[PDB]
Design a protein around this motif. Structure first.
Motif, PDB file in Angstrom:
ATOM      1  N   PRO A 195       0.793  -1.156   0.051  1.00 40.82           N
ATOM      2  CA  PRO A 195       0.196   0.043   0.018  1.00 40.82           C
ATOM      3  C   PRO A 195       0.771   1.268  -0.009  1.00 40.82           C
ATOM      4  O   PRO A 195       1.741   1.294   0.445  1.00 40.82           O
ATOM      5  CB  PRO A 195      -0.841  -0.006   1.331  1.00 40.82           C
ATOM      6  CG  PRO A 195      -0.986  -1.586   1.740  1.00 40.82           C
ATOM      7  CD  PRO A 195       0.406  -1.989   1.122  1.00 40.82           C
ATOM      8  N   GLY A 196       0.291   2.344  -0.534  1.00 43.33           N
ATOM      9  CA  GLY A 196       0.956   3.581  -0.519  1.00 43.33           C
ATOM     10  C   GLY A 196       0.948   4.121   0.809  1.00 43.33           C
ATOM     11  O   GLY A 196       0.657   3.760   1.859  1.00 43.33           O
ATOM     12  N   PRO A 197       1.731   5.559   0.637  1.00 43.71           N
ATOM     13  CA  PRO A 197       1.579   6.161   2.081  1.00 43.71           C
ATOM     14  C   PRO A 197       0.475   6.773   2.475  1.00 43.71           C
ATOM     15  O   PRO A 197      -0.651   6.920   1.686  1.00 43.71           O
ATOM     16  CB  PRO A 197       2.796   7.210   1.523  1.00 43.71           C
ATOM     17  CG  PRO A 197       2.660   7.465   0.074  1.00 43.71           C
ATOM     18  CD  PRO A 197       2.149   6.181  -0.263  1.00 43.71           C
ATOM     19  N   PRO A 198       0.411   7.183   3.526  1.00 45.70           N
ATOM     20  CA  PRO A 198      -0.819   7.895   4.248  1.00 45.70           C
ATOM     21  C   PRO A 198      -1.216   9.078   3.472  1.00 45.70           C
ATOM     22  O   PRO A 198      -0.270   9.773   2.887  1.00 45.70           O
ATOM     23  CB  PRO A 198      -0.479   8.106   5.576  1.00 45.70           C
ATOM     24  CG  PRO A 198       0.427   7.175   6.013  1.00 45.70           C
ATOM     25  CD  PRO A 198       1.115   7.041   4.802  1.00 45.70           C
ATOM     26  N   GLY A 199      -2.396   9.502   3.351  1.00 44.24           N
ATOM     27  CA  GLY A 199      -2.849  10.817   2.656  1.00 44.24           C
ATOM     28  C   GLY A 199      -2.474  12.077   3.796  1.00 44.24           C
ATOM     29  O   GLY A 199      -1.875  11.720   4.895  1.00 44.24           O
ATOM     30  N   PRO A 200      -2.661  13.082   3.342  1.00 45.29           N
ATOM     31  CA  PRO A 200      -2.384  14.369   4.218  1.00 45.29           C
ATOM     32  C   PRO A 200      -3.299  14.724   5.216  1.00 45.29           C
ATOM     33  O   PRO A 200      -4.450  14.168   5.374  1.00 45.29           O
ATOM     34  CB  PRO A 200      -2.525  15.422   3.081  1.00 45.29           C
ATOM     35  CG  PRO A 200      -3.349  14.915   2.022  1.00 45.29           C
ATOM     36  CD  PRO A 200      -3.088  13.548   2.103  1.00 45.29           C
ATOM     37  N   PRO A 201      -2.997  15.521   6.028  1.00 42.85           N
ATOM     38  CA  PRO A 201      -4.062  15.718   7.043  1.00 42.85           C
ATOM     39  C   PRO A 201      -5.217  16.531   6.402  1.00 42.85           C
ATOM     40  O   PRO A 201      -5.022  17.058   5.518  1.00 42.85           O
ATOM     41  CB  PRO A 201      -3.455  16.921   8.125  1.00 42.85           C
ATOM     42  CG  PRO A 201      -1.854  16.421   7.864  1.00 42.85           C
ATOM     43  CD  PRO A 201      -1.538  16.138   6.467  1.00 42.85           C
ATOM     44  N   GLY A 202      -6.316  16.449   7.061  1.00 43.69           N
ATOM     45  CA  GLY A 202      -7.452  17.159   6.509  1.00 43.69           C
ATOM     46  C   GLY A 202      -7.323  18.619   6.736  1.00 43.69           C
ATOM     47  O   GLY A 202      -6.448  19.303   7.478  1.00 43.69           O
ATOM     48  N   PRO A 203      -8.414  19.251   6.235  1.00 47.93           N
ATOM     49  CA  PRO A 203      -8.689  21.031   6.274  1.00 47.93           C
ATOM     50  C   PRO A 203      -8.817  21.264   7.804  1.00 47.93           C
ATOM     51  O   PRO A 203      -9.119  20.444   8.799  1.00 47.93           O
ATOM     52  CB  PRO A 203      -9.820  21.098   5.533  1.00 47.93           C
ATOM     53  CG  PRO A 203     -10.537  19.857   5.315  1.00 47.93           C
ATOM     54  CD  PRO A 203      -9.621  18.706   5.517  1.00 47.93           C
ATOM     55  N   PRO A 204      -8.542  22.372   8.267  1.00 51.09           N
ATOM     56  CA  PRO A 204      -8.982  22.918   9.572  1.00 51.09           C
ATOM     57  C   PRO A 204     -10.530  22.864   9.667  1.00 51.09           C
ATOM     58  O   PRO A 204     -11.341  22.817   8.855  1.00 51.09           O
ATOM     59  CB  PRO A 204      -8.756  24.389   9.416  1.00 51.09           C
ATOM     60  CG  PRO A 204      -7.588  24.497   8.253  1.00 51.09           C
ATOM     61  CD  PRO A 204      -8.087  23.556   7.579  1.00 51.09           C
TER      62      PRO A 204
END
Lengths: 27, 26, 26
Positions: free
Chosen positions: A11-20
């Motif tokens: 599997p790929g890397p984790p996605g980015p954090p969400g928005p505020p």
């Protein structure tokens, strides 16, 4: 004859954090 | 001879929740 | 022999929004 395809990769890397989040309520 | 490379793996997991929002109005 | 492993998958999706901020000033 060559062999069959290799195994899937990992599997790929984790996605980015969400928005505020939204503002808090009025004081 | 070896075969071809396998397919890509699946997508990674979701990222973490974002940061907190700003304070509310006065 | 089987081929080499495939590449890593794509990145995951973003996480969800963060929590609301604190209430506003007095």
């Amino acid at each position: 004859p060559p062999g069959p395809p290799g195994p899937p990769g990992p599997p790929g890397p984790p996605g980015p954090p969400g928005p505020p989040g939204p503002p808090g309520p009025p004081g």
